Design a protein around this ligand. Structure first.
Ligand SMILES: [Mg+2]
Ligand SMILES: [Mg+2]
Ligand SMILES: [Mg+2]
Ligand SMILES: [Mg+2]
Ligand SMILES: [Mg+2]
Ligand SMILES: [Mg+2]
Ligand SMILES: [Mg+2]
Ligand SMILES: [Mg+2]
Ligand code: NA
Ligand code: NA
Ligand code: NA
Ligand code: NA
Ligand code: NA
Ligand code: NA
Ligand code: NA
Ligand code: NA
Lengths: 385, 385, 385, 385
């Protein structure tokens, strides 16, 4: 289960670089130079890295310092063959963003947030990124009167519309991906799930430029089924990028390595991504636990990729097994894929077999055979066939 | 705090009529005749009632029995002045719907579900309903292989598109409202939140015919902020109807009387509905607990309306208080409502005050004053001003 | 992975016998004769069955009917070699128990609940049961004023103390096991977790007679770590019985087959039970989903046992692997098992290496190596070593 | 609603002193001198303050610096009349505690944790504290193999037993209070709820020295009913101290001001504490949100006390209202307080009215009248009587 760059595994600089500061504790690891992270990840078989502006260029750097930081990073990419498929903006760490970036109540902060974002879009394009992610982690509230959500959504739309005008006017081939999260660090975050983000996109001026970047753990913080949400995003044509990690239920955002947390959900996710032909990066937004030293950081990162590859093998074996294909027919998955009424409304209304002469009791007595199907799926996951 | 029909309070027949059967227990109350429910609710000051097909006409009734049930109900409405603003279909109780109605794997069940729905749309129009609700309580799965969600969403779209074709072809002035719920009775339900439902509507052939019917307790079963979700639905122009009740956090669907559960969320909800000018019914989808006899049923129903009226008074006093209006300005709610960049993209890019000369530290030092504002809101809610 | 009676797998009559009635739907399966359930479970390799009084003897049966029901059941046990290791009382279905049994506000109901329980203790002993379970599913409240919890705990203690007096006076070799659940069907249930039940037992007059019967899904309905709770019960000497099933997070009680839900938690549970030498029944309290016909019921029951046996194999391989044993030492699990200060308090106070000369920075720099250990555990679970 | 020192309101130095650093953001406020906090809290009407060792004496201070910090603090207490009723140890911030203090896998860390605690017990006694709190925030795990929970509980017991030996040998009149929390910062924390902590205490060598310090938000992070848990702690005689705050459901630990979060739970909590005669400090463990400047810090702290006083008034009015007293009898709260069977086991067995001649249907038909009672409670809370 050895990863190669062809597997498209990518990691944020902030993942393996997380120093271990949590709400109750100081850092347990030293800061990593981005150049070292690029080299170590390349050795593990990664395809590329991603960054927030402030991960690569320290906040407040002069133009000359910014140039030197980019030049060093560029050489590490050239030395390793690593790519940069996605970039994003840090609109959450600095105290100025304490009430948000795009939806801060203060108008001057909203304008600053846009200018900070635009500067990093230029850099992202220069480095070859195809997707620009926005995680509005400070957009929200702890109390009901602090934020009129209709006005906030107007400001959020205004911001994204301006960014779309910018990329169109510059001729850039980049697209945007909105990352939902339900809460943390704000008591409630705006656009809290994949669904809310998909709905918001349809009210933008150029909806074709915008998709979603769902994260495993974030949907699970609302107790939602992550594979189901991904299926809706795929159905809408909006899965532009994905963040892979693990989460144990409804609690703080754990950002465990992929495969940890809900293992069966991870299996169904990989099955769906591979069956649907998702061709984007397999990006890990995870935190090596602060119990670990640097050897544990790299072990945790390697485990992300290993678990994806094991699950890919098991899901492929499941779908290829003739006994599973038989079970899928026994459970009428084939009938689910056929139109209910391709004959049309009038034919349905005139069809006595659909109502007047429908034997509801005979239909009700048919078992769905879902438990046998699910035990075949369990046996395949566990390698017990 | 006496309700009158002008307050637009409505109740489902299945609410006060719930006999108290739960997963672990038999019924504790006898069945109520719908005519009795109409008369008792009218005496309490309700404006109207709502129904599933099977609440009003026992499943399997002949055409002659169906006529007699409707005639009796019609006379009770005429005797009381009660209205019927909304109706819905029961696609969840009968065993034939064990894998869903519109998204059942069996094609013959999907066709039956559509025919059952269409027959009740005709009745709803005859009785004067303006909104037709769909709660897809059996649409979903307990296991990952049982339901291909992309195919299921195709079938769900097909069903709603056919219903839109039907109402358009008949010339009916009714609109549809989709009611989300995240789980229960299925392990995961399709379209689990307001956001997912809003996103789905935008892929229908005639999106203008469809909105949402959010329920307080359902969004709270995902730990989401119900007022925030309602604000997004209002922002999209899609709040066609609402179900009011209470829920204590993430657990089974409790359907407590409105005002129970999260009281502060109820306050912020009423503030939003009244401030936005929502003009639809204030519908209660609640269950009097099975500990209660019939006197307790009517006390619980009266409490729904009383709590709405108290909260309406307190929210109005909050918004009218000059000290609150001052606090809203101190917290820059006025600035949130002003455009970020009505001067346009180029002016923003050329504005040195937005980036090059922006004093981030001075902006960061400004307190938001949200805690003082929230304590004024608490004082108003509690009548402690 | 074929079960045999030596594996001690047991099932409640109410599990495979669940007819599929849920809060929103009618039964999808016919009732099973208990004699048929005994015969089918014996064929699958089960060791025994368990029952509520009302599962075996229909409520309200005369003494002569009760005798015939027991006689038939007895012959099925004799014909199959099946045992009855545990029995319990239904104090939740009948409307009389709508406010509880042992903690109902009405005193006459509390006395009836005790008499109903005592009659079934006699029957349980006659059938050879060694454990008598109490699940107080109706003990609790939906609202704060309805139940003074201190008085309710006095009544709960009084009830359990009287039951202990009864079994002691009769000379019975049976012990009691309290089953916690946090909510459902009551809004909050008294003794909601393993911890609360363990604490309550210590205030009974004869604590040695009472232990816990934890259920996987119930602790998970509070978001708790089930293996951790089982470890505390084992540490206290109080794990008298266990209910095995699956649950997907914080929602209604799903009672999925064992191995479904949180698969990694199931692995760690089996590892703990087998390592600790738990010798009681491996009892499944599960519901075959109502989508299933009778063939699916038996497939789901077989899957419970199969998943336990697979996980047992994988946990044993994990603990026996020399590379895992090395990793456990690298993570200092050996040091966790050694006393902190067997030298005593005074020696600790005089030990300068414990404070004055302790190198906190060198200790802080040591990685715990937990991620490598956890990936070995993942590889073993998945059969990818 | 003006607080005075007689109300026993206390605050941790770390509450109003929280600088606003969260997992995703830097501090938004400067550090507060403990002397300033004492003076400002005294002006607001607080009774006293509490501290972790490291809040008062910077980690790593020499003995001479430690003396100066204590002397300054002592003078501020003398100048203001403020008391110090409780103290605690920081066993969570420094990287050395990344795997715990008392249950760290490394034995040398466990010994250091004990020595650090003992030094602060001496200081707590010198300052007049009557309760010593232990919050084991780092005791736990992110993964299953990292921590053998039985061994960890042995180490936890060993640590608390040694602390009890220390205070007994020194003749100190201090008692210990264990503070549960289910998760955060560890994936799962040992002793996750009030119940688990109460059960653990009963296995200590001197259980009389140990009680609980429950926190509103922590029990709510498991979805539990906080007033119910407090009632069990009172019933056991173990409520030594309490932490008051607010929390919106199952998510990260919010530490909102008291009265925020679940307002009705706050009402029932105050009703219980006042009715039971709890005489300990009313301690606030809260964080003024990082949106606030220093004026907002003091407004948030004042709001904690104001909300307690409003709720105290409303709960007292509820219990004193003759209509409520009538409703309590109608709901049989009086019967709940009477023994089930003071006549004894034999009399119960011989009482035909308890079983043979008990009219189960007549008893089942009696309504509990809980909804009317709960609406009276709502009306009192809202001041709408
Ligand atoms: Mg995350
Ligand atoms: Mg992410
Ligand atoms: Mg509901
Ligand atoms: Mg509803
Ligand atoms: Mg269960
Ligand atoms: Mg059970
Ligand atoms: Mg807290
Ligand atoms: Mg605390
Ligand atoms: Na746009
Ligand atoms: Na996960
Ligand atoms: Na349509
Ligand atoms: Na609620
Ligand atoms: Na006893
Ligand atoms: Na589970
Ligand atoms: Na002790
Ligand atoms: Na709260």
């Amino acid at each position: 289960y050895q990863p190669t760059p062809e597997d498209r595994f990518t990691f944020g600089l902030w993942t393996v670089g997380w120093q271990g500061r949590d709400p109750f504790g100081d850092a347990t690891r030293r800061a990593l130079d981005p150049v070292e992270s690029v080299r170590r990840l390349a050795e593990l078989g990664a395809h590329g890295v991603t960054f927030h502006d402030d991960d690569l260029i320290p906040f407040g750097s002069s133009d000359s310092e910014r140039e030197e930081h980019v030049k060093r990073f560029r050489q590490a990419l050239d030395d390793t063959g690593m790519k940069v498929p996605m970039a994003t903006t840090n609109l959450f760490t600095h105290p100025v963003f304490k009430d948000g970036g795009f939806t801060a109540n203060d108008r001057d902060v909203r304008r600053y947030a846009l200018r900070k974002t635009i500067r990093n879009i230029d850099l992202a394009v220069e480095l070859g990124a195809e997707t620009y992610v926005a995680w509005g982690g400070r957009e929200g509230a702890e109390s009901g009167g602090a934020k009129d959500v209709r006005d906030a959504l107007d400001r959020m739309k205004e911001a994204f519309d301006l960014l779309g005008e910018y990329v169109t006017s510059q001729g850039y081939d980049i697209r945007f991906a909105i990352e939902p999260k339900p809460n943390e660090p704000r008591g409630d975050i705006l656009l809290p799930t994949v669904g809310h983000a998909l709905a918001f996109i349809e009210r933008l001026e150029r909806p074709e430029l915008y998709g979603v970047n769902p994260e495993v753990g974030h949907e699970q913080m609302a107790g939602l089924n992550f594979p189901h949400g991904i299926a809706q995003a795929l159905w809408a044509g909006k899965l532009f990028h994905i963040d892979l990690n693990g989460q144990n239920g409804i609690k703080y955002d754990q950002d465990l390595r992929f495969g940890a947390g809900d293992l069966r959900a991870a299996f169904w996710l990989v099955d769906l991504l591979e069956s649907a032909g998702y061709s984007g990066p397999r990006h890990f937004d995870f935190k090596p636990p602060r119990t670990e030293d640097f050897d544990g950081v790299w072990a945790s990162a390697a485990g992300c990729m290993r678990n994806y590859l094991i699950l890919k093998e098991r899901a492929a074996a499941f779908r290829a097994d003739p006994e599973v294909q038989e079970a899928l027919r026994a459970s009428r998955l084939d009938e689910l894929a056929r139109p209910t009424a391709a004959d049309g409304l009038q034919a349905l209304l005139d069809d006595r077999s659909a109502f007047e002469e429908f034997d509801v009791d005979a239909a009700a007595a048919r078992g769905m055979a879902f438990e046998r199907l699910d035990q075949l799926a369990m046996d395949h996951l566990l390698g017990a066939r």
